[PDB]
Design a protein around this ligand. Structure first.
Ligand SMILES: Nc1ncnc2c1ncn2[C@@H]1O[C@H](COP(=O)(O)OP(=O)(O)NP(=O)(O)O)[C@@H](O)[C@H]1O
Ligand SMILES: Nc1ncnc2c1ncn2[C@@H]1O[C@H](COP(=O)(O)OP(=O)(O)NP(=O)(O)O)[C@@H](O)[C@H]1O
Ligand SMILES: [Mg+2]
Lengths: 160, 41, 476, 109, 512, 96, 347, 204, 29
């Protein structure tokens, strides 16, 4: 009865049931995100996280509704609706054919991401205090100097 | 029909030609890679 | 007391906004021709100390209607149903005395999210929903009274409370601006016996970062120290000291520990002055404050990088050198057997820089150089609107078991080669280092011009040549 | 422990209580403070900075401050806010070999 | 229901009975009180309104007596309507913990409420009850049992047509510039996710504004700025001019030009430099659902675009040969390397910044999918149908587990070296693209810097990319180091590789 | 060693029980030793058998545990204990 | 309401006393001849421990959700005191009421009454029933080659699921319905299948072949270089079956009768997960060899079963390319009118 | 069991005890672990002796297997486990208005520890729309804070009762003429202060 | 509160030596 510490972070403190500290759990949540998005998927049988049928249906319904508003207020319905809901009925047969997965990348790595650009990236280590925690916890403010704003990022986390 | 099974998974589900072509892209030490394919080494 | 708009300083938009409501309240001039109904509620959000109360008093006064203000300190109580009782009481008496202005403080301490939590929520949210049935509720209206609430953070309030229709307008109250401080300090001196050689521009460009209550406290300490000194007035130097004591704090330090402070600050300043990619120094002290138990060297904030995010690679290497310079100089002067525990956090900062170089695809490994970071990036919302915290996950699926050893070996090479480099740098410039530490020991605080002067008159010729080559360029 | 062993002539479990303490300090000598010669200078790629005692579910006693171990804890500056904590990526069991070997060298000297 | 409640005289003929109770549930701002007052006004019957909080007070038994008196005198003046808004504070589910008096009085009032409302066992008692909540899950299931609250109705937030109808009704009595119809249409398809109260408040504030700034009627730009600033807040200031801003503009222009030359992507709407938000910088923006409906594209058009054959999207043409979910996805790695490639081409490694590192740090995931999970890599298409990447699900403790046969699969099949080959080929492609389109990137940057709103439109960007000729790869400003990796002689195509294999057998003669 | 007064009184009551189990009325010394041994064996045996587990006790009748403890399995325990006690006797300074 | 457990809202005064009185009346000096206390609740776990002890409250009876026939009988029995259609067949209407309860059936027939009354008719007709459900509720976008690929996939899979002995019956086959990019092949679900019956080896191999069918059809008709990744869940299930035959049922001649996998059901994602065992390299390689042999043989049999039915395959894929959707009867007829060749069944 | 741990002097640096006390604890601990195995009243229902734990694992659990040769797993064929704690052959046999809405949305809103987290678009959903989402479903900070709060509040409800139980159990040997049977199922989770002589010694 | 009582994070090359020493102690006994 002796472990050898194979797959884990080297020194980790205990968790709220013992120690009220919340950093290990905050890193574990991103670990689980990585698992679901790269390795396994959300059900047994998927190549990755995929856009479900319920959503492919909701995209169709949003576009249908916007197209109607437009034409109708500027100025073949219930059939599509009923067959679309009986399409919704499946929602669980995991053996559906989804030929491509580029919509996931285009929606989750271009539209929610590097389509944009973050501007708070780094900082020179020489602040009015000897730290960044002390500055962020200081009494008054130190992010004002026109008086533009100059802030610093949080420290990056690593988890291997 | 194979009666000798090799310690490597590459040699089980690949043809000899494919192995001799692809074995340089493996993640093993050189002494291991030198043990796969044609015994000429 | 009665307050008016001009007694308040700055917040020009708050005024502009809280002005429309004055126009709508006392003198309904044009809003019949416009067709616009009157806004019923205003939410004053901002940090505490920026006076989000006297603004309510000012709007109520300049509009000239009753002002029955009550905080939630009398709204928090555990007996049976009394919160809703006092809410009905305040609201029905405001309806009887209508028109009126109901201002309420402490809204975040009561108007939190309705959920299980503790037992108190069986009462706490009860009061809340009584609140909810007073603003809109039934009755379809009462008069159109104005209800205003002061809260620090809008993100914590209930969903039903912050909805358009219960709080129509929402205005921010930030810390005073440059001209905001200019005006807020001068309106705070007609109540002070003061001299005439006062130019408020120096104070406005010197008190940047404080809240209004802190400016008033500055004036208070100025007057009290004028009394305790034996004078009758306060002039330039007087204020300067007052604000310098209110900002940089005010403990004994031995003469043996003081030389460590001096050596490390002088080494950091000499490094940051001789490296052409780092900003110039602005002042270096050795007087510990109440929160930083050692000296500080402060650099001129370069606005370009801070606003765009263009932190090059050259700059990151030099920042590594600067982070190690302190320990380099300590070991150079006081001998290796005297390394201290004053460079723990500078070592953590050097580690941060060295790992950011590797994880930002700047390495020199061919499988890493311009291609990859370390692992998978995942961002998370911080305690603010625009702040995001990064996380990197590294597993067997992206690191191949012998790139881990290379990551370690290269970060280690960066750190220790940087240390050797900065150590040789300080070796070549010993004269300037000792001159700087003597001057720092004798003055306890110096500015950038003295540093640059000393180092240019005592530095090594080749380092000065390099420093002169890259002297004109804006960004590097 | 070494005195008991050199007088009695035989090992005991007294050593058990020393090395433990010593090992802790030795790690702090190599990783956190950076006094050793691990790498050419003493700067390693990883270090374990303490956390404040506020996180624990603490207690209260009528005792004074410990002889050294609570009095030499005055030089640490623990971490207080959670969103500014730094933790480098753990070493790689071939770097860990060399670092623990530096600890061993210190203890043996 | 109110035609039935008020002398039906036709519903009694088929015995259709009224529901003895209704619950209205939905988010805040939906219209449950408004609707209550509406049915009251058209109800012409006694209407007793209360709130579920006025019941509990100082003493004990008072809440029970209060609900007793309410329901009793309501039964006395039948037929009537009762309306308790926010029963959440009174009809909360009884817990099993908490020995405080407040719980005592609350559940005692709950018991009284119950026994009274099921106290309509005299079916002819035509007392109708209505509650409105936004916390429907907190209700005790003893309330929703049949015979007490038979029906609940959900008030959803409005869709496009309902939003246009609300902004139509709440605009009678206000001045509208030109045709108000198109204004209402635009702000209806621009206020997605809004409630009803929010739309009403939007109309009111607009009218206040017109006065405040001396304008006769409300126009479209003013209401657009209104809705934006109400969504986000105040409008942050632009970026100060520097030499850092020039490099930022250059890398953003390189990202835009690379997004506009990738085959098979959605249309680009605008390229901005200001963004008016706090924390965010420049952006590249693509069309939304509205422009899709206006252009009539299939909702998932970016997926189908991997199989069409002769078309043109921004400045990329594909001709009579489709991409294949491998070229289609591995085409994404070039726009992610464009900024860093522009920097390394103009300045060298010293110019590599932290601005360009965050996209670049997200390419191993895409290439790992292309090589390992996609199962369409040309190397693994010709093996037996083995699944080398199987995980066998999670237990209730939430931990995954692995296919137990997979000892050493990822090391022997070589997924890592393949991924790196893909990434290095992509990097060289991006370098060449950036070296060829140098002048185009220069002009896009210069033009978006000297713009009115620092914003350029997708049509104009495409026009710039199309209108200027390619450069010459001759090392005019190519850093010298990156000027060697750009004449690499790519070796792109397969046929010149196949003919050098076929030239080894004697029987075959090849033509052109 | 290490006992208190409560331990001594509990031991004497247990010794009365152990004297009953041998057909006697007065406590002897071997009844005190048997009380100690019985305390210990009770403690272990109660910690092993606890659920569907089991497998240590050997006289209950049920499938796991035979009734008369086969003699071939008693010779082995005798050999085990003889070896252990012999080694503990010839080792200098061991307990007694 | 009275039968709450201890620790309820009391201090040992009110609810305690009423529980003790219930006990004393049920137990102490009972003269309770003929008396039955028929208590009713919905969460029987909350009742106090002292009340369910033997003698007091022991019989517990459960009522489950009614089924098609149950709710059909409910609707019949409720139709007595009302003015419902003189004669309306409605068990098929009950099929549209899946997941309901008796209370919801009462409410739905009342809603139908109100809906008929809204129409002014004093006689409730059948459509009102449907009307209830309706009021509670409130060119070619696709390129050619994609339609071809998906249609060939579905054709192969349906063909092989048809000619395989003892497989389920096809219920629908659709390719991009409503232009939603998707394709599938539904099989009719029955309650007749008893899961307690064991699985022969022949049945498992037949399922493996049916799963590899679609990928093999794509490879045969369009070529390797045009194969996509849409046939991935079928590949997963084929590999799952092949691993369970070897490591969980001892059907491999080289591993033997050793048990290395164990299916298990979750606490109710997915319904199931597995329990695995840590193997060495020798054992793992010996098992992988057999798994690979099984999968290769299954692929070969699928290729033959498709190649000898080329005309039926052509007819079926053309029917899918022009119609878009087919049911079971129509695909059966299309396959029979073209000379389909069933696999034998040796047993 | 009413409520040692060295993790305080490793990571939190508390160190509120004198050096001689720590040394004494260490001495007694090693001696107790090594030489009090199978000794009456001194070495008993004690969790500080590893051999007692070995014995319980040897007679109660099934044989445990070694570590695996797979990657991306911890040591065995499993993933890392949570930080904060809240028959058949094949799978071919494991695939078989008020109440509807209220209970669906009632069981939909509850907290689920094993749900991953969703991510936001870097330009958060516009204002009011964001309020329609439970906070614990798109932010790690909020979810982790909620889980920690739950676990700690659940821990703080132990409230040892062994004192009064002990006195009233020691009460009944001054009376005469009745007997008391106390039955249980898990005698090892009981406190050792009850098993002390004079309170509950006779076991059956 | 697979059961494990101890835990170690020493490198594999020191674990080899430590276990060799334990084994030879047991062999002498
Ligand atoms: N804009 C301002 N102009 C002038 N004085 C200001 C201004 N804002 C705040 N003050 C000063 O702030 C003090 C009163 O602040 P106060 O209203 O009490 O802050 P608060 O909103 O109530 N938060 P707190 O006082 O911490 O509860 C007075 O000394 C004012 O002169
Ligand atoms: N159908 C509608 N048509 C027009 N305006 C509407 C409609 N429904 C609501 N409104 C407007 O929305 C406001 C009334 O909303 P309100 O009655 O407060 O809704 P609620 O659902 O009761 N909100 P809350 O009490 O916070 O949960 C007024 O401005 C109405 O004019
Ligand atoms: Mg309302």
């Amino acid at each position: 009865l002796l472990s050898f510490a194979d797959g884990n972070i080297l020194d980790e403190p205990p968790s709220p049931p013992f120690s009220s500290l919340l950093i290990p759990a905050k890193r574990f949540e991103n670990y689980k995100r990585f698992f679901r998005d790269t390795l396994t998927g959300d059900k047994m049988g998927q190549r990755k996280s995929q856009i479900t049928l319920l959503e492919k249906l909701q995209y169709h319904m949003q576009l249908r509704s916007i197209k109607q508003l437009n034409a109708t207020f500027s100025s073949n319905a219930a059939l599509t609706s009923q067959k679309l809901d009986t399409l919704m009925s499946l929602s669980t047969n995991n053996l559906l054919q989804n030929p491509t997965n580029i919509n996931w990348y285009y929606q989750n790595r271009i539209l929610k991401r590097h389509g944009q650009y973050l501007t708070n990236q780094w900082w020179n280590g020489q602040l009015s205090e000897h730290n960044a925690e002390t500055v962020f916890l200081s009494d008054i403010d130190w992010r004002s100097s026109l008086d533009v704003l100059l802030d610093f990022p949080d420290t990056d986390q690593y988890y291997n | 029909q194979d009666n000798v099974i090799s310690w490597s998974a590459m040699e089980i589900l690949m043809s000899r030609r494919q192995v001799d072509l692809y074995k340089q892209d493996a993640d093993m030490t050189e002494g291991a890679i030198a043990k796969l394919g044609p015994p000429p080494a | 007391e009665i307050i008016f708009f001009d007694d308040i300083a700055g917040n020009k938009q708050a005024k502009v906004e809280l002005m429309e409501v004055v126009d709508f309240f006392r003198t309904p001039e044009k809003f019949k021709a416009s067709g616009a109904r009157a806004p019923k509620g205003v939410l004053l959000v901002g940090p505490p100390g920026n006076g989000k109360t006297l603004m309510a008093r000012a709007v109520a006064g300049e509009s000239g209607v009753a002002f029955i203000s009550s905080s939630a300190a009398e709204f928090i109580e555990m007996y049976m149903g009394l919160g809703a009782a006092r809410v009905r009481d305040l609201f029905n008496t405001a309806r009887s005395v209508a028109p009126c202005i109901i201002f309420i403080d402490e809204l975040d301490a009561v108007g939190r999210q309705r959920q299980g939590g503790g037992r108190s929520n069986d009462e706490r949210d009860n009061t809340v929903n009584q609140l909810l049935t007073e603003m809109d509720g039934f009755e379809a209206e009462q008069q159109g009274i104005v209800v205003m609430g002061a809260t620090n953070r809008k993100d914590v309030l209930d969903a039903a409370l912050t909805r358009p229709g219960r709080f129509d307008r929402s205005i921010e109250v930030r810390r005073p601006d440059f001209q905001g401080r200019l005006e807020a300090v001068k309106v705070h001196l007609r109540d002070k016996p003061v001299a005439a050689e006062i130019d408020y521009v120096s104070l406005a460009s010197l008190m940047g970062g404080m809240s209004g209550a802190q400016i008033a406290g500055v004036a208070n300490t100025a007057c009290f120290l004028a009394s305790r000194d034996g004078r009758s007035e306060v002039n330039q130097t007087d204020l300067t000291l007052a604000v310098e004591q209110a900002k940089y704090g005010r403990r004994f330090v031995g003469a043996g520990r003081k030389k460590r402070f001096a050596v490390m600050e002088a080494s950091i300043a000499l490094a940051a002055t001789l490296l052409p990619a780092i900003e110039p120094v602005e002042y270096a002290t050795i007087i510990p404050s109440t929160r930083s138990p050692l000296g500080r060297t402060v650099l001129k904030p370069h606005v370009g990088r801070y606003t765009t995010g263009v932190w090059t690679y050259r700059y990151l290497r030099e920042q590594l050198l600067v982070a190690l310079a302190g320990r380099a100089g300590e070991e150079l002067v006081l001998g290796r057997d005297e390394l201290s525990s004053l460079n723990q956090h500078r070592l953590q900062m050097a580690r941060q820089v060295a790992w950011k170089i590797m994880n930002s695809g700047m390495s020199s490994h061919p499988d890493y150089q311009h291609l990859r970071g370390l692992g998978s990036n995942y961002f998370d919302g911080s305690s603010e609107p625009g702040r995001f915290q990064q996380t990197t996950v590294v597993m067997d699926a992206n690191q191949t078991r012998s790139e881990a050893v290379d990551a370690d070996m290269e970060v280690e090479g960066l750190l220790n080669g940087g240390y050797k480099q900065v150590f040789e740098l300080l070796v070549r410039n010993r004269a300037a280092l000792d001159a700087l530490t003597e001057l720092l020991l004798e003055r306890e605080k110096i500015s950038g011009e003295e540093v640059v002067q000393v180092v240019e008159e005592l530095g090594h010729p080749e380092d000065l040549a390099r420093r002169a080559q890259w002297a004109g360029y804006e960004l590097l | 422990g070494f005195a008991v062993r050199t007088a009695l002539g035989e090992e005991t479990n007294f050593t058990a209580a020393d090395i433990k303490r010593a090992t802790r300090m030795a790690k702090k000598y190599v990783f956190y403070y950076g006094f050793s010669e691990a790498g050419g200078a003493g700067i390693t790629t990883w270090a374990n900075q303490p956390y404040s005692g506020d996180f624990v579910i603490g207690q209260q006693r009528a005792r004074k401050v410990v002889s050294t171990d609570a009095m030499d804890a005055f030089a640490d500056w623990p971490t207080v806010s959670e969103d500014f904590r730094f933790d480098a990526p753990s070493p790689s069991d071939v770097t860990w070999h060399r670092y623990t070997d530096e600890v061993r060298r210190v203890l043996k000297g | 229901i109110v035609r039935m409640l008020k002398g039906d005289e036709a519903y009694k003929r088929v015995g259709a009975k009224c529901p003895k109770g209704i619950i209205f549930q939905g988010p805040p701002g939906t219209g449950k009180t408004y609707l209550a007052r509406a049915i009251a006004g058209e109800a012409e019957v006694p209407f007793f309104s209360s709130v579920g909080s006025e019941f509990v007070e100082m003493f004990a038994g008072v809440a029970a007596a209060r609900v007793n008196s309410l329901f009793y005198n309501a039964r006395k003046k039948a037929p009537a309507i009762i309306f308790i808004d926010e029963i959440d504070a009174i009809g909360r589910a009884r817990s099993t913990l908490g020995g405080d008096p407040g719980s005592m009085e609350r559940e005692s009032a709950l018991l009284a409420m119950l026994v009274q409302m099921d106290g309509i066992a005299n079916k002819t008692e035509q007392v109708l009850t209505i509650g409105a909540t936004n916390l429907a899950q907190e209700l005790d299931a003893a309330l929703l049992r049949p015979g007490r609250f038979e029906v609940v109705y959900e008030v959803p937030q409005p869709g496009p047509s309902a939003r246009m109808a609300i902004l139509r009704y709440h605009a009678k009595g206000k001045p509208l510039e030109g045709d108000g119809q198109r204004l209402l249409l635009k702000t209806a398809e621009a206020t997605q996710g809004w409630s009803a109260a929010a739309l009403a408040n939007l109309m009111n504030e607009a009218a206040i504004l017109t006065v405040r700034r001396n304008v006769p009627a409300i126009s479209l730009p003013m209401v657009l700025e209104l809705v934006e600033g109400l969504n986000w807040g105040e409008q942050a200031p632009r970026i100060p001019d520097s030499e850092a801003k020039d490099r930022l503009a250059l890398i953003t222009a390189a990202k835009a030009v690379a997004f506009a030359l990738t085959p098979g992507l959605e249309p680009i709407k605008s390229v901005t430099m200001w963004s008016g938000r706090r924390g965010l910088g420049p952006s590249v923006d693509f069309i939304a659902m509205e422009d899709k409906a206006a252009m009539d594209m299939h909702p998932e058009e970016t997926e189908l675009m991997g199989w069409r054959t002769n078309f043109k999207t921004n400045a990329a043409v594909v001709g009579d040969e489709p991409l294949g979910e491998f070229a289609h996805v591995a085409g994404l790695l070039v726009p992610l390397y464009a900024g860093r490639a522009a920097e390394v081409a103009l300045f060298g490694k010293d110019g590599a910044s932290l601005a360009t590192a965050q996209p670049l740090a997200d390419c191993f995931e895409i290439a790992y999918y292309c090589v390992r999970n996609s199962q369409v890599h040309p190397r693994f298409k010709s093996l037996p149908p083995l699944h080398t990447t199987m995980w066998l699900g999670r237990d209730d403790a939430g931990r995954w587990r692995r296919d137990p046969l997979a000892i050493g699969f990822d090391e022997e099949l070589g997924y890592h070296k393949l991924t790196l080959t893909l990434l290095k080929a992509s990097w060289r492609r991006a370098l060449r693209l950036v070296a060829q389109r140098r002048s185009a990137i220069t002009k896009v940057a210069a033009e978006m810097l000297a713009a009115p709103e620092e914003k350029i439109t997708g049509a104009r960007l495409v026009e710039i990319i199309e209108s200027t000729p390619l450069d010459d790869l001759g090392g005019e400003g190519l850093d010298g180091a990156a000027a060697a990796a750009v004449v690499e002689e790519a070796g792109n195509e397969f046929l010149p590789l196949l003919k050098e294999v076929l030239g080894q057998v004697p029987g075959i003669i090849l033509t052109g | 060693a290490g006992f208190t007064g409560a331990d001594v009184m509990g031991l004497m009551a247990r010794a009365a029980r152990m004297a009953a189990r041998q057909g006697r009325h007065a406590i002897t010394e071997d009844d005190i030793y048997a009380a100690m041994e019985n305390k210990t064996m009770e403690a272990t045996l109660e910690a092993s058998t606890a659920g569907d587990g089991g497998g240590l006790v050997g006289g209950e009748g049920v499938e796991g545990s035979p009734d008369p403890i086969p003699p071939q399995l008693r010779r082995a325990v005798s050999v085990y204990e003889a070896g252990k006690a012999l080694l503990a006797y010839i080792t200098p300074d061991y307990e007694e | 309401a009275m039968g709450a457990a201890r620790g309820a809202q009391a201090s040992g005064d009110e609810s305690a006393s009423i529980i003790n009185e219930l006990l004393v009346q049920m137990d102490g000096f009972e003269d309770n001849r003929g008396i039955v206390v028929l208590g009713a609740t919905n969460r029987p776990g909350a009742i106090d421990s002292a009340l369910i002890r033997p003698g007091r409250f022991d019989r517990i009876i459960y009522m489950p959700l009614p089924d098609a026939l149950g709710r059909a009988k409910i609707m019949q029995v409720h139709a007595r005191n009302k003015a419902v259609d003189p004669n309306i067949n409605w068990y098929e209407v009950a099929r549209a009421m899946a997941g309901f309860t008796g209370a919801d059936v009462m409410g739905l027939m009342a809603r139908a009454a109100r809906m008929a009354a809204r129409q002014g008719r004093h006689a409730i007709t059948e459509d009102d029933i449907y009307a209830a459900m309706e009021n509670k509720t409130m060119p070619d976008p696709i390129p050619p080659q994609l339609r071809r690929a998906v249609s060939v996939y579905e054709a192969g899979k349906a063909l092989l699921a048809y000619i395989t002995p003892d497989y389920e019956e096809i219920a629908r086959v659709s390719v991009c319905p409503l232009n939603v990019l998707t394709g599938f092949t539904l099989f009719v679900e029955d309650e007749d299948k008893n899961v307690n019956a064991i699985l022969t080896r022949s049945e498992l191999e037949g399922r493996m072949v049916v799963h590899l069918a679609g990928r093999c059809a794509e490879k045969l008709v369009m070529g390797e270089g045009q194969m996509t990744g849409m046939g991935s869940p079928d590949l997963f299930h084929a590999n799952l079956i092949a691993r369970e035959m070897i490591m969980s049922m001892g059907m491999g001649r080289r591993t033997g009768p050793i048990d290395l996998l164990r299916v298990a059901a979750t606490s109710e994602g997915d319904p199931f997960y597995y329990h695995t065992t840590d193997m060495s390299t020798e054992q793992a390689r010996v098992a992988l060899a057999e798994v690979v042999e099984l999968l290769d043989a299954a692929e070969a049999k699928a290729m033959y079963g498709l190649a000898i039915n080329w005309r039926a395959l052509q007819a079926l894929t053309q029917a899918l390319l022009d119609r878009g959707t087919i049911t079971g009867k129509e695909v059966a007829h299309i396959l029979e009118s073209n000379g389909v060749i069933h696999f034998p069944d040796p047993y | 069991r009413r409520p040692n741990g060295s993790f305080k002097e490793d990571f939190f640096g508390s160190q509120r005890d004198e050096v001689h006390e720590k040394n004494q604890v260490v001495y007694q601990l090693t001696r107790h672990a090594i030489t009090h195995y199978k000794k009456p009243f001194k070495g008993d229902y004690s969790l500080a002796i590893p051999t007692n734990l070995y014995v319980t694992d040897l007679f109660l659990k099934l044989p445990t297997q070694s570590i695996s040769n797979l990657t991306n797993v911890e040591n065995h064929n499993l993933s890392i486990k949570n930080k904060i704690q809240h028959n058949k052959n094949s799978y071919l046999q494991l695939t078989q208005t008020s109440p509807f809405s209220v209970l669906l949305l009632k069981e939909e809103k509850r907290l689920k520890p094993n749900k991953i987290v969703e991510e936001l678009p870097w330009t958060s959903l516009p204002g009011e729309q964001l309020a329609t989402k439970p906070r614990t479903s798109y932010s790690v900070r909020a979810k982790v804070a909620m889980l920690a709060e739950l676990s700690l509040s659940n821990l703080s409800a132990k409230l040892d009762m062994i004192t009064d139980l002990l006195v009233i159990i020691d009460s009944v040997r001054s009376n005469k003429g009745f007997v008391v049977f106390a039955t249980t199922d898990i005698p090892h989770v009981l406190d050792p202060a009850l098993r002390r002589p004079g309170r509950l010694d006779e076991t059956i």
